[PDB]
Amino acid sequence: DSLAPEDGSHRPAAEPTPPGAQPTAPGSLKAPDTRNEKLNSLEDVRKGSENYALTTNQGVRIADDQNSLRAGSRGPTLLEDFILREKITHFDHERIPERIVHARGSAAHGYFQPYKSLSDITKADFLSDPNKITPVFVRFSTVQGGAGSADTVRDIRGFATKFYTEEGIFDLVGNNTPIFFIQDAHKFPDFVHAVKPEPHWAIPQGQSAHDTFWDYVSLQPETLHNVMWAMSDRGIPRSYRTMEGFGIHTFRLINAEGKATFVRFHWKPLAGKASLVWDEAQKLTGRDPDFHRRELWEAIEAGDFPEYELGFQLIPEEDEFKFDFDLLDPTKLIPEELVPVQRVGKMVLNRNPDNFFAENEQAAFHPGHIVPGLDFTNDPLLQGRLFSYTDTQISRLGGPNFHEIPINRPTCPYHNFQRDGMHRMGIDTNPANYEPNSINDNWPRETPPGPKRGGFESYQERVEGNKVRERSPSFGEYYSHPRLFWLSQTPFEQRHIVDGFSFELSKVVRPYIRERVVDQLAHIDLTLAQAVAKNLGIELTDDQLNITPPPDVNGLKKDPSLSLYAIPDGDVKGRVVAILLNDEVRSADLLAILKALKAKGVHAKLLYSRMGEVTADDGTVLPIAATFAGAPSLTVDAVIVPCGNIADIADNGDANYYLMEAYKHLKPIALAGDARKFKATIKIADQGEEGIVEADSADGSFMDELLTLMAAHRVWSRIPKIDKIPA
Amino acid sequence: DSLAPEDGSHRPAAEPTPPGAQPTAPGSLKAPDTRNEKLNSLEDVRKGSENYALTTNQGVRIADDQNSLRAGSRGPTLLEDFILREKITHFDHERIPERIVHARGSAAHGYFQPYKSLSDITKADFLSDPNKITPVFVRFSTVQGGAGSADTVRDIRGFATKFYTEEGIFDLVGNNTPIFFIQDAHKFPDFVHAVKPEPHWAIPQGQSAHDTFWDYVSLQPETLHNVMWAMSDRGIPRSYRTMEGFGIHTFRLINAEGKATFVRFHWKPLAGKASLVWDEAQKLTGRDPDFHRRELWEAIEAGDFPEYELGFQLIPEEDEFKFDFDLLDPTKLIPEELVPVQRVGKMVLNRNPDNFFAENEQAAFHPGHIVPGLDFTNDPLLQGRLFSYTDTQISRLGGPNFHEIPINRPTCPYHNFQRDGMHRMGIDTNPANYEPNSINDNWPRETPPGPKRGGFESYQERVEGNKVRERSPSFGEYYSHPRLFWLSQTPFEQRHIVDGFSFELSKVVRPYIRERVVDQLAHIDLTLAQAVAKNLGIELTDDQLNITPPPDVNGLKKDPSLSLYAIPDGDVKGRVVAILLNDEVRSADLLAILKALKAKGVHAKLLYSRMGEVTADDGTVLPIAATFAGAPSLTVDAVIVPCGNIADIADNGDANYYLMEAYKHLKPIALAGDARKFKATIKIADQGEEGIVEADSADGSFMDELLTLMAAHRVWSRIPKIDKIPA
C-alpha cells in the first residue's frame, strides 16, 4: 500500500554509513553478508515479514486488526473474540525478571582468533591453532542500576564473552577493573544490598553516593582498593571501546601433559583508553541515557568495529608464594611491571543483533562454563560465583532448558540423559535416559581425558586442612595496593579521584560516616586524605597525621599501566566532531574541514538552530543533523566553527553555551576567520592559548593542530582556567 | 556493639523534619502514630530487628556471617555449606517481572473521606456517610520507561487509588490528562510498542522522540488530542502534588432505586497545578533521576501531606446524545464549562511505606475492581482493559493468589470456594468447596441485591445489534478537541507546545514522517502548524494553507480549565528555596529571610562550595546542606543570595552559573546588599526588572516581593530575555 514513502527513504542502505546518516536497522538487514557459524545457525529461528499476512500465533489470518468484536458498533465486547484475547494475553506477559546485578547492558556479535598455537601451555582447542576463528557474543554492562537505568553513570562496567568453541561454550565473564570489592562470596549479598537503591524508598538509582554504600565501605577496608578505581575517571568511560577488561581471578591453564600454569586474563582496547569527566558524564545521563548503547550500535554500523587483544599474565606453579600479596586474593592486582601481559589473540565485534530481547536479554553467561585446558583455583569469591549463575536462570529464564534458548545453544554437539523440564525443545529418540544401559548399548558414552577431544577431568590439587569458615591471614592487608594505584596516577588524574570522593561523600547525610571514610584514606596516603577532608570541612587529628604509610608492593613504587593517560594511545578514528553552521557558510572552510576529517576516519555532525538545510556561499546545500540544543557538546569530541555569516549565530545563547560547556569539559575548539569573535565568550587572550586552534581560514595546518589535540583526548592544561567559567 | 555512633546520630527523629534535615526512614519508624485500618492490619506481617539474632530462614542462628565453609582457610568451598547456599539462593531470585507499562512509580498511604452522603445518586457504601473514612494506597507512575528509568521525563503520568471499602476493594486507576490516545483496546499493544524502546536496539528510554512513535501518530489521527497534552507543559509536572488526575472513561453510578447516572471522575490538586519547563526537566533527569520519588517521600515526612478533591461530572441518562462528541469516546473530554465538576470528598496522603518492594512493587490495581453502586459502560477501551489486569498478574505476581499478598488484601471479609494455586496462604476449613451443597448447609451463601450490604448485580442495559468488529461513526472526528485545548492555552503555554513538537520531531531521522505530522497539525490550527514547520525547515503547501478549521465543541470557543496557568492557584507551602552562603554572612539578612519563609511554610537549603559549616558575622554557626554543584538550581524554586563577604563566592563559576540557570528557568532571584553585584552576571539593568527582587538588606518587603513571585510559580514575562543567555 503506501504508508511507505516512494523514493524508498524509509529503508537504510545496507552498507556502512556514518553515525546518524540513516535510520539504524536489525543486523541482518543492515549487514546481510557478515556471517559466522553462530550467526548462520540462528537462521533457523529468524522470522521475516514482507509479503506476509498478519496472523494469529495459530496461523489464522486476521481481516480486522483495528476493532474488537462487539454486539453492535456502540455495544459491549464479547468474550468470544479470541483474536483480541490472544493479542492482549501475549502483551500482558512480555516481561521476564531482569538480571539481579548487571541488568543494564549492550551486546554485539563477532570473532576471536589466536596469534599462534598455545599448545605448550593449554590443551584448550579454541587456542590451539592461529587459523581457527571462534564465534563470540559479548555483552557490556554496568553493575547497580536496573535495565531502564542510564549508561554514563559512575560505576564498574561488566565485560562478558561467550566463546562458541568446538569442545563447548567457554564464558569469560569479567569487568573493567582488575580487582573486585569483596574477598569472600558469602558477603556478596551484603555488598550488593549496600550499593543498591535503599530498601525503604528505592533511591538512588545508578549511584553509590548514599549512606549505606559508604557505611559498608568504612566498615569493610577490603573494599577500598576497588572503590579507588570506581572513584577515578576509570568509573566513567567514553565508550565500551575505550576500556580494558579483566577476569579478576587467578585460573589454571592445563596442558596435554598435565602441567598446570596460573593465569590472569586481560582485554586490551585497540582504540586506547579514554574517559569522560564527571560534570560531563552526569549531565549526559540526562541529555542521552542511551549514549553508550547508541554509540556501540553505530560504531559497528559505520564499520568502526571494536577490537581487543586477549592477554595472559602467566605465573608458574612454583612462584605461587613469590609475591607479597596472595595470588588467590581477588582484591589484589598483579603489577604488569612484575608480571607482563603476553598478547595471545584478537577479538572483533562486527555485527549487531536483530532483536534485543531475544538475543541480548535472554543471554545467560556463567564463569563455570569452562572447557578442557582450563580449570579453577581456590579463590573464595570465584568458588561462590560458581554456585550462583546456574541457580539464577531457573527464575530469570524460566527453567533448566535455558541452553535451548537460541542465543545460548552450543554450535557443537551436546547429548546426555537429561529429560523434561519447562519448554523442552529437544525430542529425544534414545530408548535409554540413564546410564549404564545395555538397551541403546550405552550411548551416548563417557570419553577418557586426552590431548584433543577428551573428557573433562579436574586438576588433582592437594587439599589438607579442617572444615573451617575462616579467612586466610594472607588476605589481611588492605592498603598498599590502593596506594600503588594512587601513586601511579598523573596529577590531574589524582585531582579527579579527590573530587570523586568529595562529591560522593557530600551526599552522605550522616557525617560520622564521612569521617569514618576519611580515616581510612589517611591509612592509604595523607595527601589524598587532606584533600578530601578539606572539601568536606573535616580536620585531621594529629594522630591521623602520624599514621605510617603502607609498604610497597614487591618494592614497586608506581606502575604506569594503572593510569589511563600516562603512556598515551588514542584512536582518533571513530571519534565525532560538531561543526556549527550559519546561513552563509564559507565552503572553502567547510570542504577543507571535511576532507581532513574523512582522511583520519573522524565523523562530523553539521549542527544549526533549525532543522532542514542551509546553503553555503557557493549555493551548496547542507542538510542539518541536529540543533545545538538537540545534540549538545556533551555528545561530541571537539567543536569546529567555520567562517561565514557569523552574525547569525553570534547572538544565539545556545551556540555560545555550546562553546562554554565544551571548553569546560576540556575539549579542543577550532575557530576559523570571523568565528574567532567567540574567543570573547570563553574569555581568551588575543595572544591565544593551548587547545583553542584559530586561524584566518580552515586549512591543512589548522586541521593538523586540531587532529593532534584530538589524538591527545582532552586539553588537561586548561584545568586551572575552567574554575572561573560559569557553565 | 559500636558501629552505631553514640550521640545517637544514625537514627532520624520520629517527628516531622524539613527536607534533608535527617536521614529518611521506614514509615513506622518515622511516624509511629499515623495509623489507619489498612496500616494496622499489615502489623501481622511487619518484621523488626533490634536485639534479634541473625538466622537462617529456618530459624538456625548464624555464628560466622563473613566466611564460607572451606577445607582449610585457603582451600575449596564445600557443597555442605547450607548457610551460604541459602543466602545466595534467595539473592539469585530477588526480582519479579516489572509492570509491562507504568513500571516506574511511587506510592503512599492515606485516607479518603466524603463531604456528604451521595445516597441519592449511588448506593456505594464508601460514599454513603461523611463520617466514614476509607484507607487508600496510591501509586503515581510514568507510562514508557522501566522501573529504573528517570522521574522528570516528558510523558503521561498514572494516578491509581486503592480504596479499602467495607464492601470490597474499589480501584480507581486513572491518569493525569482527561482523554487517552486510542479508542479501541485492540490497538493498545501497537500503540505501546510504538512509544516503547525500538525492537532492534532498545533505544530510547523514557522518550517518544523517535521515529516509530511519530510514525504511528501520523497514521492514526485519533492519537492527536492526547499527544497535544503530552507536548504541553502538562507532560513535565513539578510534583505528583501539582497535577490533576482523571478516570478518563464514562462510568455509571447506580442508586438504591436502580437509577443509573453517567459520571466522569476528577482529582483536583489542593496545592495548585505547576510544571517544569523542558530544559529544566530534561537536565534534572541527569542531575537527580529520583526527583519525583524523593520529593513525595519528603513532603510526607515534613508533614506537607498531599491532598486532592474527588470531583464528579454527572450527566443524566437522557442527555446521552446531547453533545456533539460521543460520551463513550475516550479521546473526547467533557468541557467543564458544559458540565461542572462537583467536589465530593477529599484524600490525604500521610504515610510512606516501610518496604518499597513489598508494598509498592507487589501492588496490583485493576479497573474491574468495582463495588455495588458503580458499574461500567460500553466504552471500547474500558471494555478491553477489563480483560487485562487480571491476566497480567499471573506472571508478574506469580499466580491466582495475588490478593493474599499483604498490601492487596481486603480489610473486609472475603469467603468463596476457590481453592489451591501457587503460595496459597488460606487454610480452608469448609467441608465443601462447591455450591450448591448440603454438607456445610450451603455456606458461604449468595446475597440478593439491596440498598446496603447486597450482592453485585449488573445494570440491565439493552443491547441490540449484530456481532461486528466495527468502529461507531460517532467516534470519527479527530480535530475539534485538540483545537479547543490549543485555544484555551495562555500565549507562553502555546509557545511551549510549539517547542515540544519541534524538539521531538527534530529527533525523527526520516523527514517524510515529520512532514506527515505537520500536515495533521494544519488540520487543527494553522498558527500551530506554521510555527512547528518553521523550526523544522518545512514549507506549507498553499493547499495546507487552505484547510478549513474544525467546528467548535458545542459552541465553546475555549475553556480556561484546560490551561495550567490561566486562573491561578499556588501552594507556596512545601516549596523550597536555595540560599547561597559565603564565609561572613550577615545574620541580619539571614534571620529575616528564614523567619519569613518559616511563616509561609517554605523550606530553605543553605548551600556553599564546601561541606561542613560557616560562621555568620556574629559568630553563629551555619551547617551547609549541599554544595552549589551538589544541589543545582534545578532542584529548588527560587534563589536568595544574602549580603556578607560577597568577594568569596563572586569569582566562583558555580555560584554564578547557579544564578544563570535559575534565571533562564524563569525562577524568582532575590539579591540583598552587595549580592546585587551579580546583576552584572545575569545582565540586568540598574533600573531593575521583574522577577529580580533586590534591596539594601533582606527584610519584610524584600521577602514579600519574593513570596508573591513564588505564589505565581515562574516569571513568564522574562521569556523574551532568556534567549540571549548562555546557560
Ligand code: HEM
Ligand atoms: C570478580 C567478581 C565478579 C565479576 C568480574 C562478575 C561479573 C559479572 C558480569 C560481567 C555479569 C553480567 C552478565 C551479563 O552480562 O549477562 C555478572 C552477572 C551476575 N553475577 Fe557476577 N561477577 C562477580 C562476582 C559475583 C559474585 C560473588 C556472585 C555471586 C555469588 C555473582 C553473581 C552474579 C549473578 C547471579 C549474575 C547475574 C547472572 C546472570 O544473569 O546470568 N557475581 N557478573
Ligand code: HEM
Ligand atoms: C484510559 C486508559 C488507561 C488508563 C487511564 C490506564 C491507567 C493505568 C495505570 C495508572 C496503571 C498503573 C498501575 C500501577 O500503578 O500499579 C496501569 C497499568 C496497566 N494497564 Fe493501563 N490504562 C489505560 C489503558 C490500558 C489498556 C487499553 C490496557 C490493556 C488492554 C491497559 C493495560 C494495563 C496493564 C496490563 C497494566 C499493568 C497492570 C498491572 O500491573 O496491574 N491499560 N494502567
